[PDB]
Design a protein around this nucleic acid. Structure first.
Ligand SMILES: [Cl-]
Lengths: 152, 147
DNA sequence: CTCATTGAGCAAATGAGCAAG
DNA sequence: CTTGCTCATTTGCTCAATGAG
């Protein structure tokens, strides 16, 4: 129901694309996030990084913010990592989540019947998860950048 | 009415039983209404839905037939919902399409006319809830006594 | 008058699909 | 293959008429 404004969304998305490129290269200290460390264990040592990545300071700050906000919802954290860190597309994530989808009570069109959600529902849910993650991350990251600019 | 969990249990059982019946594993001698219903379904068909075994299928068939043999209209609705898979809205629309004028006396000045689709939806909802409420205890006792 | 019933319709959810890039 | 859309169907829920008690 709640989304970010266009400017806030594009800003946070640029930052998160840079941060995901930085994380996927293996420059994040494993101690800074157990979730991201476990996610990185299944990545090949020799990687081809053709995406822009931020510096190490910004990477560390963004990682702190993302870990502090997303460690509660491990599913959304994993989706966020697959999208920004690994670079998978929303369609591919929705496809994987449609393949391994437990039957659920589908409503309205589904007649409140238990059945596996359609691919369209999985696409919508992935979009919703990403938008909600960004909506919650925005203010924390903004305040972090502002406090870094002030204290320094 | 039934509790949420009782309804979920009975609805799962009836969904499996409807898939089983739609596959044609029920003997015609077990229920004339179900046989008449199966006469009007496309013979060569794919299923792709989970169904119970034959013992549970026959038990549920006996229960539903003993409970629903009185109201053939409600029996047909139940079969259309669980066996054929039609939705409540589709059933209400089909019965609104084929609805003879009736004496409506609330909105409408007691004039003979076709009942609105809203009333058909309500009637379908009311019929399904009553069928499940009447079926639940019989099926529970049947499953318990089979052992 | 009070209120249950009918007629009418809407927002949200879901499934399926499509065209441009 | 991806993405952002359109279109149709189902459900539960309101709201206005309208007549019985
Ligand atoms: Cl069940």
């Amino acid at each position: 129901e709640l989304n970010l404004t266009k400017e806030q969304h594009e800003w946070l998305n640029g930052w998160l694309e840079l941060w995901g490129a930085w994380v996927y290269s293996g420059r994040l200290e494993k101690r800074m996030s157990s979730v991201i460390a476990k996610f990185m264990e299944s990545v090949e040592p020799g990687r081809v990084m053709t995406r822009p990545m931020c510096n190490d300071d910004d990477g560390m700050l963004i990682s702190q913010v993302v870990d502090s906000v997303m460690y509660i919802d491990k599913k959304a954290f994993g989706i966020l990592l697959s999208y920004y860190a690994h670079g998978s597309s929303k369609h591919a994530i929705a496809s994987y989540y449609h393949r391994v989808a437990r039957p659920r009570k589908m409503l309205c069109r589904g007649g409140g019947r238990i059945q596996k959600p359609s691919l369209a529902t999985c696409r919508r849910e992935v979009d919703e998860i990403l938008n909600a993650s960004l909506f919650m991350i925005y203010p924390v990251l903004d305040s972090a950048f502002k406090n870094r600019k002030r204290v320094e």
